[PDB]
Ligand binder design. Structure first.
Ligand SMILES: [Zn+2]
Length: 257
């Protein structure tokens, strides 16, 4: 029964998931001045041409758009990664106000929202096996600032009215995730974990330096979703983000100067 409230929020997670106080926990504050520029980092290979979405689902914490990951259709290569990573699903973390919502911060700067494209390493067979390996997952974090509208996001926004409550799902085919990327693929990378329970420490994080712009009307329909299920008292799905965690014995690396 974890959530983002007062009595089950991220401050209560360690009592049911003691790994929450682990070494490689996410998110963290990306200090751009201590981030070490690594010239040995290859450019990110974002191959989303043959991406095949299936369904968008409200799971009571966010909304996931699920992709067909039984083949190499939308993969992420290069960068700090060794091998191939299949795109399985993506989700957003947003806040009740435009000055908060992102899980990662850039010099303590909180963005309005953060997009998380979750991938799993193909050399482990499926997602359930990849989460149990330190190099099993790779999430492509992308910040969202409130400005001009993002066209490629409009299909996701218009379908949120059909998945208002927890447990609701709807067909979501032929969505291109390439429309959610910024112009530049400069990134920071560091070893981390899932930012939600079970908080498994298995994620290679890739956080793009450049954010994407979305309109206030686009993010205002994120905030119309509900944590609760149908027929229950309404609790708006806002502030579904985990605050930063101690970096501890970790060095964040950059692909740019
Ligand atoms: Zn996430």
């Amino acid at each position: 029964h974890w959530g983002y409230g007062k009595h089950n929020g991220p401050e209560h997670w360690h009592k049911d998931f003691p790994i929450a106080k682990g070494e490689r926990q996410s998110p963290v504050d990306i200090d751009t001045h201590t981030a070490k520029y690594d010239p040995s980092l290859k450019p990110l290979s974002v191959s989303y041409d043959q991406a095949t979405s299936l369904r968008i689902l409200n799971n009571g914490h966010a909304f996931n758009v699920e992709f067909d990951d039984s083949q190499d259709k939308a993969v992420l290569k290069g960068g700090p990664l060794d091998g191939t990573y299949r795109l399985i699903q993506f989700h957003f973390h947003w806040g009740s106000l435009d000055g908060q919502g992102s899980e990662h911060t850039v010099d303590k700067k909180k963005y309005a929202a953060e997009l998380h494209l979750v991938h799993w390493n193909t050399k482990y067979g499926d997602f359930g096996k990849a989460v149990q390996q330190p190099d099993g997952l790779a999430v492509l974090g992308i910040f969202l600032k409130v400005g001009s509208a993002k066209p490629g996001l409009q299909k996701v926004v218009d379908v949120l009215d059909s998945i208002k409550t927890k447990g609701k799902s709807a067909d979501f085919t032929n969505f291109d995730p390439r429309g959610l990327l910024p112009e530049s693929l400069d990134y920071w990378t560091y070893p981390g974990s899932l930012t939600t329970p079970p908080l498994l420490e298995c994620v290679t994080w890739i956080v793009l330096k450049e954010p994407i712009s979305v309109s206030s009307e686009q993010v205002l329909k994120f905030r119309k979703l509900n944590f609760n299920g149908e027929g229950e008292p309404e609790e708006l799905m806002v502030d579904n983000w985990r605050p930063a965690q101690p970096l501890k014995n970790r060095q964040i690396k950059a692909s740019f100067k």
